[PDB]
Structure 1
């Protein structure tokens, strides 16, 4: 279950965040920790496509090789806080699992600048029981978390020492697919 009402960044700049580019997850914290593996790869693109607010997601378990992409149109709850109904797709946007009620995530941008961000998500998927997931993002897939984003982790009353890094997993990403999936 999720337990946090994440607070969006004061003065969040939506056009800068949703600029069509890619964000890589460098570090994550799930508050139900046995909900996700301890070794993982994830990234997203975020942008407006023909007037519609979109994200494209990529997940990869580097041990099992389990791989999936998703596309969503985000709905606005408030600035920096969204509800996203997702469809599982191949890398080319062909639908594998259609949008369905009950398959959605919330998405809150707690901090962002041009290069780094801190987000919260709460996934809802069928009858699964899932927890709060925080992720540190960077534009550069190899970037160590800087003091701006680490300060934001502290300001969220979290300990960055708790976060698990994705950097030692040899993660390789198809940026081209993420960007193109925004239109799908």
Structure 2
């Protein structure tokens, strides 16, 4: 279950964030115990495609090899806060699981600059009961979190020391498929 109304960044620059490029998750914080694996790889691309706000997601469990992509058209709740009915797709955008009512996530951009971001997401997926997940993003998949984003974690009244790193999982990403999925 989700419990947080995350506050969007003051002055959030949507066109910079949603520029069609890839963001890598470098660190995350799951508020529910035992909710997701400790070891994981995730990335996304975010952009406008033929006038529509879109996100493409990639998840990979480096131990099980469980892999999945998603694409969504984002709807706007307020600047920096979005809702999105996700469809699971293959890497080429072919639909594996259609959009369904009740399958959606919310997405709040709590901090962003050109190279780093802090987001909150609340995923709703039928009968599961996932909780709040915060993620530190970087444009560079290997970047250690810098002072701007770490300060934003503190300003959200969170402890960066509790975030789990994705860096020791040998994560490798198909950047091309994330970018192309934005159109699908």
TM-score bucket (shorter structure): over 0.9
Looking at structure 2, the residues matched to 174 and 39 of structure 1 have their Cα atoms a distance apart, in angstroms, of 19
Deviation of 1:127 after TM superposition, in Å, equals 1.1
Q: Cα RMSD over matched residues?
A: 0.3
Structure 1 residue 33 displacement after superposition: 3.1
Measure, in 2, the Cα distance between the counterparts of 1:35 and 1:101.
22
User: Separation in 2 of the partners of 1:91 and 1:129?
Assistant: 26
Q: Deviations over 1:132-173 (max 9, x none)?
A: 000000000000000000000000000000000000000000
Q: Deviations over 1:113-134 (max 9, x none)?
A: 0000000000000011110000
- Cα distance between partner residues in 1 of 2:2 and 2:44: 22
**SS across alignment from 1:82:** strand
SS of the residue corresponding to residue 16 of structure 1 reads: helix
Alignment TM-score, normalising by the size of structure 2: 1.00
Question: Which runs of no fewer than 5 residues in structure 2 stay unpaired?
Answer: none
Aligned structure 1 segments of 4 or more residues deviating by more than 6 angstroms = none
Measure the CA separation in 2 of the matches of 1:49 and 1:33.
Answer: 37
Q: Residue 133 in 1 paired to residue 128 in 2?
A: no
Determine the C-alpha separation between the residues in 2 that align with 1:25 and 1:141: 8
* SS of residue paired to 1:161: helix
Distance (whole Å) between structure 1 residues aligned to residue 121 and residue 84 of structure 2: 10
Tell me, in whole angstroms, the C-alpha distance in 2 between the residues paired with 1:80 and 1:95: 27
Which residue of structure 2 lines up, in the alignment, with residue 111 of structure 1?
111
Aligned residue-pair number: 184
Q: How far did 1:37 drift?
A: 0.3
Per-residue deviation, residues 67-103 of structure 1 (Å, max 9, x unmatched): 0000000000000000010000000000000000000
